[PDB]
C-alpha cells in the first residue's frame, strides 16, 4: 500500500545487521569478512549499533551492504580521507532510513532534553573503546560540505571548531580546543535532502 | 569527494533515460522492452520527461531501472491501484535525486512564480496526448498516505478535492469538481523524507 513500505529490502539489511551485531559481541574479527571494516560504532540511547567500513570514495557503501551487494540501507562508512588514529576529525556517513534505522536516530539530538542528557558516541577498535560527548548538533542542506578531516595547523583547526560549534542548535558546556580530537556523524544520500543531520563529538 | 556525488550510478540512469527519450520520439513501442510500461509523462518547463510503469505494489520500481536492474534513481511508476482509464485520480511516484533528475523538479512548484505560469502536466498514451492544469502543490511528511485512486461517490470525491486544494501552498484560478479527472505526482523514497513534494493537476 504505502510507497516504499515493501518489507523485503529492509529485511535484507535488518538480517545482515543483527547477524553482525552478534558476531561483534562474541568478538569475532569482522575484517576477515570485509577487509574494508575499520571499527564498530554505537550511540547511547539510539539504535545506532553498526559496523563502519571505508572505501576509495564517499559513495560506494551508501547503497551496498557489508558483503558488497546492492542494498537500500547500505553500510555506515568513514570518509575516504581518513587515514589513522591521529586524524583530528573522523567523519562517518549513513542513510536516514524510513523504518528508523542506520543514522535515523541522529534526529534525536534535535530534542533539547536528549541533547542535555549527554549521550556518548562510542567507537570500538581492536577491543578498545573510545568515547565522545556531543558538543554540537545541527541540520544542514543537501549540498553541505563543511566537513574537514585534516588541518595544516592548530589555528585552522580551532577556526573549524569555532564554526561548527557556533552552528549547534543547542549550547553545550564543553569547549573543544586544537588539542582535542573529534568525530562527526553525518546523514548522507544520493537523493536530495535539505534536512541532513550533523553531530559532532569530542574524544573524552 | 563529496558524500553521494559519485558519477557512475547517475550515469547509469542518465544513459537509460535519454535513450528512452530518443525511442519515444521515434514512436517505438516501449512495452516490447518492458511489459509493465504504461505511458509517457512530461511536465512543461522541467526536465521531467520519463516513462511510467506499474508493478503489483508501490515499491518495486523505486530502485529499479526500466530493464528491472538495480539503480539509485529507479523508474517513475503508477500506483498499483490505478487499474482503469476512468480512474478519478492517477497517482505516480518518483525519486527526488541530488542531480536534479526524476521528480526533483516538482520542487520548482514551491515558487509562487513558477506555479502561476500554469505549466501543464502531460500524459502521452497510444499517440493521444492528455493535458492537465496544476491546481494544488505542497510539502508533506515522510508518512503522507492521503493518496486515493478512487471514491464511492461524488461527495467523497469532492471532499478529497476540497482537502487537497486547501493544502496547496498557493491558490489557483482553477476550480476542480467531482466530474473532473485528476493526476497526482508524488515524491517517494525508502528513506525518511519530511520534505516531499506532492502536486495535483486537472484533466483538460
Residue numbers in the entry:
A (entry chain B), B (entry chain A): 39 to 242
What does the paper say about this structure?
The C. difficile 630 genome possesses two genes with homology to known sortase genes in other species, but as one of these is interrupted by an in-frame stop codon, it is thought that only one sortase (SrtB) is present in the bacterium. A recent study demonstrated that SrtB recognises the LPxTG motif within putative sortase substrates. Characterisation the products of the reaction of SrtB with an SPKTG peptide in the presence or absence of meso-DAP clearly demonstrates that the C. difficile sortase is capable of the transpeptidation reactions characteristic of the sortase class, and responsible for their anchoring of proteins to the cell wall.
High throughput crystallisation screening with both SrtB and SrtB C226A yielded small crystals in one condition with SrtB C226A, consisting of 0.1 M Phosphate/Citrate buffer pH 4.2, 40% PEG300. This is not surprising given that the loop is devoid of the triad of glutamine residues which co-ordinate metal binding in S. aureus SrtA. The cysteine and arginine residues are found in a deep depression on the surface of the enzyme, while His133 is shielded from the depression by the side chain of tyrosine residue 227 within the β7/β8 loop.
